[PDB]
């Protein structure tokens, strides 16, 4: 069954380059062999205020962005967390279990505890795999480690999840500062690519990216952070490997890399934003996906809370 | 409709005096002319470690003791917290509402967070007004505040519950160390009253109650706490007044006040474990009010939750 779990919080209209290749991507490469469960964390989303209007309509555009990025409804389950009872069920179960300070080393109560809510999220699918970038791992160590605890207390209860490193050329770095990060946390948008942004906008944005002065195009992240970064984000979007890149890179400059860059990022993120139009513009098809997607994620979860339920001694 | 709501945990195989006559026999009180919910809250026993089967049976030895108390489930819905899931979906809500230093001045993350649960638990039924104890009445009024700061982002969503303190003859104080609260807290049971312990054991206790040394039987929690205490007990237990005991015990010593005290109490648990024993050892009729008890509950938490989820701006 190889089960995997992941999700993205419907936090702003667009996800960027960071998400698609760096996440969505391994997705859609685990989907046909592993029983997958893509999930949109709303509830993640409202430990900082959120307007109602475009919560609702975040929610839907990140499923579409799925969609849109190759998710197959017809062989993963897409759901939105809210709908799920289960998660909430269980994340207070593994608060129980979970030193303060164990959190703390991770204000309002929601942003100290949805650490919890996410080993909750994972957990309550027998979860055998997430795939995190190494920076959201910490994350899943915390749910591992309460698992591990509450298994400790009633053995054989809850999966264990294994940590699935995307390949590090999924690691998307800001186009302005590429030593951090591409991140919604940048202070302007000028360093990062929304894959529904304009694609002219985008290509700009490419075309500015910090380099070096080295003049010599030579895939080296911590020497040539910025012209890494580049060849990174070509290579992810058009398949071809870094080294066909370079060694086609001999002799060429930095404005060769980076046109080359923005016009495959554009080929990327046009039919992208075709299929999410169709999917805003029509949204019975949406719908429909993420309804079978909840009632297919209740009835996994809600035994799963059953089980737990049942080991603590519960009366059922 | 003056709707109630309140509950204890099922951390001990009994009730004490301080639950029976400042908890319960408010809500018997309330049940005739207010709609109640009354709650076995067991998501709250497992912030500490609990032993399943005694968690279950404290379960249902707590429903039992709220019937045999004198809980009409023809009158009031009886169930069980973890049966009802909206209990913690709205708690992460809340949870997202509620300050971490407003929540540290009230270690796991559980400890840490039940106060919001406890919040949730209440706000969750649209409850009017909550019987509580004047010393747990902070956790009230954090409820009362995080349904206010909710209620003036998205107006008129939750009711903001008023709070009911008991009459002060319901305060009852450990019998070896009558400045404190009768709590399971206590050293060792000596100072407390288990309504299910054997009466003997419960009579020999009240005897034994640490008094003064003024030989005068007049009420004065603060200069007589023991032998005001015992009035409390007495008064509350038969239901004469504290005036006509005390004009009944002019002349006399205090043995005379902890006979007649002990004699009262044991006239009072008697009762009570012969219809817990019978609804121990009978426990389908139990079953079937916490039953009916949860599917009204989640009748009206679900819509709530439902409620305050679209408020919110989560996709139904």
Same mark, same amino acid.
């Given at each position: 069954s190889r089960r995997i779990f992941s999700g993205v919080q419907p936090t702003s209209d667009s996800l960027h380059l960071g998400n698609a290749l760096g996440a969505v991507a391994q997705w859609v490469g685990l989907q046909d062999d592993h029983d997958a469960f893509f999930c949109?964390? /709303? #509830?993640?989303?409202?430990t900082i205020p959120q307007d109602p209007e475009a919560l609702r309509r975040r929610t839907l555009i990140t499923a579409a962005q799925y969609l849109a990025l190759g998710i197959d409804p017809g062989r993963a389950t897409i759901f939105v967390q809210? *709908?799920? &009872?289960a998660h909430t069920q269980l994340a207070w179960v593994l608060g129980c279990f979970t030193g303060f300070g164990q959190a703390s080393r991770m204000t309002t109560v929601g942003l100290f505890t949805y650490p919890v809510l996410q080993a909750a999220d994972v957990l309550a699918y027998d979860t055998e795999l997430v795939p995190v970038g190494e920076d959201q791992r910490q994350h899943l160590e915390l749910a591992r480690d309460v698992a591990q605890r509450f298994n400790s207390r009633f &053995? %054989? +209860?809850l999966v264990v999840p294994d940590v699935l490193i995307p390949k590090m050329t999924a690691k998307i770095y800001d #186009? *302005?500062?590429? +030593?951090?990060?591409? =991140?919604? =946390? $940048? %202070?302007? /948008? $000028?360093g990062l690519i929304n894959l529904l942004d304009d694609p002219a906008l985008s290509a700009k944005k490419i075309r500015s990216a910090v380099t070096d002065s080295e003049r010599d195009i030579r895939?080296?992240?911590?020497?040539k952070p910025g012209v890494s970064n580049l060849l990174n984000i070509q290579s992810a979007v058009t398949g071809t490997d870094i080294d066909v890149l370079v060694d086609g890179y001999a002799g060429h400059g930095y404005g060769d890399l980076k046109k080359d860059t923005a016009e495959a990022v554009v080929e990327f993120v046009n039919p992208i934003q075709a299929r999410v139009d169709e999917l805003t513009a029509d949204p019975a098809e949406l719908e429909a996906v993420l309804a079978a997607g909840a009632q297919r994620a209740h009835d996994v979860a809600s035994k799963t809370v059953q089980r737990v339920y049942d080991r603590l001694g519960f009366l059922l």
């Open positions: 949109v964390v /709303d #509830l993640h989303a409202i809210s *709908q799920v &009872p &053995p %054989g +209860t #186009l *302005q500062d590429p +030593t951090s990060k591409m =991140s919604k =946390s $940048a %202070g302007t /948008d $000028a895939y080296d992240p911590d020497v």
